[PDB]
Design an enzyme around this catalytic site. Structure first.
Site, PDB file in Angstrom:
ATOM      1  N   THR A   1       0.797  -1.216   0.000  1.00  0.00           N
ATOM      2  CA  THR A   1       0.000   0.000   0.000  1.00  0.00           C
ATOM      3  C   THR A   1       0.832   1.269   0.000  1.00  0.00           C
ATOM      4  O   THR A   1       0.265   2.361  -0.060  1.00  0.00           O
ATOM      5  CB  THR A   1      -0.940   0.031   1.206  1.00  0.00           C
ATOM      6  OG1 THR A   1      -1.673   1.258   1.193  1.00  0.00           O
ATOM      7  CG2 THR A   1      -0.196  -0.053   2.519  1.00  0.00           C
ATOM      8  N   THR A   2       2.151   1.160   0.088  1.00  0.00           N
ATOM      9  CA  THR A   2       2.983   2.350   0.178  1.00  0.00           C
ATOM     10  C   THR A   2       3.165   3.017  -1.181  1.00  0.00           C
ATOM     11  O   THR A   2       2.762   4.166  -1.375  1.00  0.00           O
ATOM     12  CB  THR A   2       4.335   1.979   0.774  1.00  0.00           C
ATOM     13  OG1 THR A   2       4.150   1.482   2.103  1.00  0.00           O
ATOM     14  CG2 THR A   2       5.219   3.168   0.804  1.00  0.00           C
TER      15      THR A   2
ATOM     16  N   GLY B   1       7.212  -4.537   3.909  1.00  0.00           N
ATOM     17  CA  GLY B   1       8.015  -4.697   5.093  1.00  0.00           C
ATOM     18  C   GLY B   1       8.354  -6.157   5.303  1.00  0.00           C
ATOM     19  O   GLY B   1       8.185  -6.987   4.408  1.00  0.00           O
TER      20      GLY B   1
ATOM     21  N   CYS C   1      11.466   3.725   0.108  1.00  0.00           N
ATOM     22  CA  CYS C   1      12.318   2.653   0.581  1.00  0.00           C
ATOM     23  C   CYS C   1      13.755   3.136   0.669  1.00  0.00           C
ATOM     24  O   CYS C   1      14.226   3.896  -0.178  1.00  0.00           O
ATOM     25  CB  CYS C   1      12.210   1.452  -0.350  1.00  0.00           C
ATOM     26  SG  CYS C   1      10.675   0.525  -0.168  1.00  0.00           S
TER      27      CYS C   1
ATOM     28  N   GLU D   1      12.409  -0.154  11.349  1.00  0.00           N
ATOM     29  CA  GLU D   1      11.928   0.776  10.343  1.00  0.00           C
ATOM     30  C   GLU D   1      10.465   1.101  10.602  1.00  0.00           C
ATOM     31  O   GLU D   1       9.688   0.250  11.039  1.00  0.00           O
ATOM     32  CB  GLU D   1      12.132   0.190   8.946  1.00  0.00           C
ATOM     33  CG  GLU D   1      11.101  -0.817   8.463  1.00  0.00           C
ATOM     34  CD  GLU D   1      10.911  -1.985   9.405  1.00  0.00           C
ATOM     35  OE1 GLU D   1      11.759  -2.176  10.299  1.00  0.00           O
ATOM     36  OE2 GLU D   1       9.912  -2.718   9.249  1.00  0.00           O
TER      37      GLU D   1
END
Ligand SMILES: [Fe+3]
Lengths: 99, 446, 420, 50, 49, 49, 49, 27
Positions: B113-114, B195, B246, B335
């Site tokens: 979803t990023t 992730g 990222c 992160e």
């Protein structure tokens, strides 16, 4: 038209073929091809990068003629040197009048 | 049509298989004609396509998803233009040998979803250049954008010499449907990102895999360096799309001699420190059930401060904390995908480096690492950092990801994504994918 | 009539620029290389900087180091022989001032061996005519240039001078086809030269520019870039002599400011001051730069007067005047009060020229430089009859007569100030 | 090799799969029966990829 | 203005016909890059204006 | 009515090259010579012709 | 537009790209003043604004 | 590339919507 593995000695079979071993894979699933190991799988490689200073420029044409009454004179310089055929491009209003 | 449940997923996977076998006989001259009219129509639709991923998802700024959709659609049509991967590759005729090539099969895919749109333009311009296909499986919060962009590339490919149903996509997904698109017999790759939630289950499925991960990359400041510059670059590359790119910055290790001048400088420009009771309130929001939350990912600065209870000015950019312990327990080394940070204290140079090896291997993968110092009076210190860290990039006096436009940063550096791995264990380096992993090659001999 | 504005194709310039540009002349088609270099710049490690970078990619190279302070029409003829023994494709100059000129004449007698030197000394001698035509250059070669000192813009201008071995005569060439096809202006190669060569050249540019504004060939194209030189040489030159390499910012702008002014005197010819210093700098053995430095303060009171001897229809009506133009420097540069007249603006310029020669450390008159009172009254007559015909008086609005050009050569020996 | 791929670590494997021989009609027979018969009695048929 | 912008396109696809117009709109679109170069021009023409 | 729509373009074509983020010490002196000329002669070349 | 956009290049401007146009290139506002002097529209004693 | 301040869309329709009525932009 050639056997699989290799022959012994007493013959002149093709010499630069790799051995039967030293030839592996990366899976088991299906429709998987093999490839030859060696000293490129055991070597992970990196990159470093510094900051370089940029560079500018100043670019132009070769020549810029200018003053009142300079279109015919300069345009004679193109025909003394070797040039034979000439195309022209123009708008519309600049052709139904005497420009 | 729509694909809801498993009873017809075995019908979609069969149609493409009927077409891929029709694709794998074309020649080199009419596949480099699809690759042209499929990249242009992704770049010429960069601004109906970002504005539609912001209204559903709820994060991100519209101004930065426009100069990222254009960078991952013309770098991929400037280097893989002339690289022969069809028919015949080479020919040596001392005794007679040739090196024909063939493709694999059908490439699954997963999308987070990023970046719901950039990492779908990139998987459909190499899976269309090496004579194969793909199948997607998106996230619920962005099911409308990803399916959109994998339709523009298709309907522009059909009308240049292509077959009909070469790409397909699920709609209305869940978890229970996805596990059947990894154990089905007739697919043999998986390109997963995100992730460390799904990449860890992909490696263990009885099939080959690669993964585009992210690990918390540190920053190191010593004494000899400039301070007026290497505080205003870190502060730029973290408010870029609110810190979801990222391989961004996540930690700032600094030596002691100038620790009391690289603290207030943050507070003046855009920072707002915290050292008291507020530190435990922010520490209980980004960690809920042993994993990361989905309540702040992508959000701006001041709103997460509203979740805890206190208030902040409006024009703030980042929230800085400060701790000294470095393992699992303290939640600032994982992160986060958010405009936050963490600064440590250290004695001298040689110990700071010792306090970065331990951060990299926590995240599992090495992606980047950056160091600020002088590069004309310490040739021996910039080379000592190249025999102790374990990543694929080592940056010197330069931000991590990239800048925007309005500058002359270095241009021929690959994007942060398109950079994956082959494992998860330990001391594993990454490398760049492209059209050499999806090509198995043969030999014949007369 | 019609003015012009000609220049090369390209000028790269910043700190850290030589290895990048030179990568551009190997990605294209270039295989064979020739180099020219002064003697001093081969015994040290300057000329190795461009020879190693070319070698790794692979191109053959050969050095040629015998050019002295001046060419003599015999050493250059050795180059045409060495040229057609290796078939070069690129001619990479290097140096400052002298060594570039000799690398310009060996190139024209490599494209045209049959051309004897009697045809290229009477058909092209002054750049105001256009009746003839020069042959096409750049068939099997193209030229490069690099600069090493700050004060001589000989890399973007078509001026080249050589002298004869037999008689001791001078033969100038001038036509707009000897200009190179790529200049380079780097500053990393000038941070080490001592503090006696960075106040002649850095005072040469000021005279190379403050005549291109007053001549009678300056158009609205060249008037501009000259006023950018005078400004960048009053904020940074004093701070490049007292500090040297400690302030690497100021050293760069002086070096990126002479070649600016070079663009001005390539499209509008120079005044008289750049003539009398040739002979006064190649017959008493003075280096060029100190000579025009000792005369620039004396000509300004000579071009500003009624001037009974002045040609008409030019420099009187077609061009406004030579006086008010000196004022417009005295208010753009910032050396005048708001309320002033014409005359008082002149003097406050002229004082600024004396207070610069003081802190930089040069003498006042010729006497302190090393010229005895033995060879100056017996050679003033064979010397003042040469400044009338050595490519000047096209500019310098006041048409000079010979019986007054020796007053300036005879009041700049005892220290007095010229006056009518 | 089958248990190695499934251990939570990277791996490669040097395997062997039964490789066939094909004889059509146009070929020679007096030669392509005496080569197959040589490359199988070489170390009694344990060389990988026989 | 308007015609001169079209007399710089009419020249480049006359000296290089086999090159389309969909390749010269994704390499060269902003003058700060210097990586990818342009095919050499000036063989069989030279443009006055 | 076409010596103003054109002329005001030059003023704006020059008062952005003296503020941008690529200007050197080359391209400033010329872009200042434009403004000085265009104030002392433009109001004359529209009232008279 | 050129009489409106000028007031939107001389302000604080919260969002600004950095490492260029903050420390390498000096500023925007002060360069709009040098034109006011070279062009002759300033008294000898005034402030920047 | 130029125009030093990095613009943003919400402040580029205020210019087109205040030079139409005749007002003057100001913060
Ligand atoms: Fe315009």
């Amino acid at each position: 038209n050639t056997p699989a593995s290799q022959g012994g000695i007493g013959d002149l079979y093709n010499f630069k073929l790799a051995p039967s071993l030293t030839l592996g894979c990366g899976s088991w699933g299906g429709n998987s091809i093999s490839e030859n190991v060696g000293p490129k799988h055991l070597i992970n490689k990196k990159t470093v990068a510094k900051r370089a200073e940029n560079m500018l420029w100043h670019k132009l044409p070769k020549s810029i003629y200018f003053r009142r009454g300079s279109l015919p004179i300069a345009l004679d310089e193109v025909i003394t040197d070797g040039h034979k055929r000439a195309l022209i491009v123009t708008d519309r209003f600049l052709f139904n009048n005497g420009y | 049509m729509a694909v809801t449940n498993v009873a017809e997923l075995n019908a979609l996977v069969e149609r493409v298989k009927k077409a891929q076998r029709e694709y794998a006989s074309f020649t080199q001259e009419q596949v480099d004609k699809i690759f042209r009219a499929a990249a242009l129509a992704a770049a010429d639709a960069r601004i109906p396509l970002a504005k539609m991923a912001v209204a559903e998802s709820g994060m991100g700024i519209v101004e930065d998803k426009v100069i990222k959709n254009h960078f991952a659609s013309e770098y991929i049509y400037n280097a893989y233009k002339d690289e022969k991967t069809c028919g015949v590759l080479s020919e040596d005729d001392t005794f007679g040998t040739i090196t024909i090539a063939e493709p694999i099969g059908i490439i699954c895919g997963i999308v987070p979803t990023t970046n719901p749109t950039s990492t779908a333009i990139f998987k459909s311009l190499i899976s269309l250049k090496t004579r194969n296909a793909i199948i997607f499986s998106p996230h619920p919060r962005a099911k409308d954008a990803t399916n959109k962009a994998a339709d523009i590339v298709l309907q522009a490919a059909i009308a240049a010499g292509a077959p009909k149903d070469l790409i397909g996509w699920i709609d209305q997904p869940s978890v229970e449907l996805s596990n059947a698109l990894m154990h089905h017999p007739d697919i043999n790759l998986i390109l997963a990102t995100g992730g460390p939630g799904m990449v860890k289950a992909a490696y263990s499925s009885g099939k080959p895999a690669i993964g585009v991960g992210a690990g918390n990359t540190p920053v190191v400041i010593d004494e000899t360096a400039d301070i007026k510059r290497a505080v205003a670059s870190v502060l730029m590359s973290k408010t870029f799309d609110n810190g979801v790119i990222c391989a961004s910055e996540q930690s700032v290790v600094v030596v002691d001699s100038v620790y009391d001048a690289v603290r207030e400088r943050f507070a003046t420009h855009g920072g707002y420190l915290l050292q008291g009771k507020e530190l435990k309130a922010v520490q209980d929001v980004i960690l809920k059930n042993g994993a990361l939350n989905a309540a702040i990912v992508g959000q701006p600065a001041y709103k997460i401060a509203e979740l805890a209870g206190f208030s902040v000015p409006e024009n703030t950019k980042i929230l800085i904390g400060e701790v000294t312990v470095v393992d699992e327990s303290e939640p600032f080394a994982h992160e986060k995908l958010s405009p936050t940070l963490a600064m440590y204290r250290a004695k001298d140079f040689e110990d700071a480096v010792e306090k970065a090896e331990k951060l990299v291997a926590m995240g599992g993968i090495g992606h980047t690492s950056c160091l600020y110092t002088d590069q004309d009076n310490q040739p021996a210190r910039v080379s000592y950092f190249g025999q102790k860290m374990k990543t694929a990039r080592i940056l010197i006096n330069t931000p991590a990801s990239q800048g925007g436009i309005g500058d002359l940063y270095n241009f021929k550096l690959a994007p942060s994504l398109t950079l994956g791995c082959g494992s998860w264990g330990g001391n594993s380096i990454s490398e760049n994918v492209g059209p050499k992993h999806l090509i198995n090659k043969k030999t014949v001999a007369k | 009539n019609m003015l012009w504005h000609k220049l090369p194709k390209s000028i790269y310039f910043r700190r850290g620029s030589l290895p990048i540009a030179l990568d551009e002349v190997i990605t294209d088609g270039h295989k064979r290389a020739l180099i020219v270099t002064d003697r001093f710049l081969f015994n040290n490690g300057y000329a190795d900087q461009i020879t190693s970078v070319l070698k790794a990619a692979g191109v053959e190279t050969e050095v040629f180091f015998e050019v002295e302070a001046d060419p003599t029409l015999s050493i250059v003829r050795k180059g045409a022989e060495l040229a057609n023994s290796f078939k070069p494709d690129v001619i990479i100059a290097l140096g400052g001032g002298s060594p570039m000129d000799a690398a310009k004449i060996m190139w024209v007698m490599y494209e045209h061996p049959e051309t004897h030197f009697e045809e290229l000394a009477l058909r092209f001698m002054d750049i105001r005519k256009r009746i003839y035509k020069f042959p096409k250059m750049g068939v099997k070669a193209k030229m490069i240039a690099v600069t090493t000192t700050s004060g001589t813009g000989s890399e973007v201008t078509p001026f080249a001078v050589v002298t004869d071995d037999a008689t001791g005569q001078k033969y100038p060439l001038a036509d707009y086809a000897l200009t190179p096809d790529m200049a380079i202006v780097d500053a990393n190669l000038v941070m080490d030269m001592p503090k006696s060569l960075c106040a002649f050249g850095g005072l040469d540019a000021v005279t190379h520019a403050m005549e291109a504004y007053v001549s009678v060939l300056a158009s609205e194209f060249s008037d501009g870039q000259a006023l950018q030189a005078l400004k960048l040489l009053k904020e940074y030159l004093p701070a490049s002599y007292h500090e040297g390499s400690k302030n690497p910012v100021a050293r760069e702008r002086v070096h990126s400011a002479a070649t600016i002014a070079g663009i001005a005197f390539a499209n509008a010819f120079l005044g008289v001051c750049h003539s009398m210093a040739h002979k006064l700098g190649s017959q008493f053995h003075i280096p060029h730069g100190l000579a025009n430095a000792l005369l620039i303060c004396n000509v300004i009171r000579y071009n500003a007067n009624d001037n009974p001897t002045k040609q008409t229809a030019f420099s009187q009506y077609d061009r406004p005047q030579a006086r008010r133009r000196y004022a417009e420097i005295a208010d753009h540069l910032g050396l005048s009060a708001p309320g002033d007249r014409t005359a008082a603006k002149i003097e406050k310029l002229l004082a600024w020229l004396e207070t610069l020669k003081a802190e930089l450390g040069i003498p006042k008159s010729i006497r302190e430089a090393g010229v005895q009172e033995a060879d100056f009254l017996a050679n003033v007559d064979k010397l003042s009859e040469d400044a009338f015909d050595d490519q000047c008086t096209g500019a310098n609005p006041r048409y000079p007569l010979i019986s007054e050009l020796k007053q300036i050569l005879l009041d700049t020996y005892y220290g007095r100030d010229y006056v009518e």
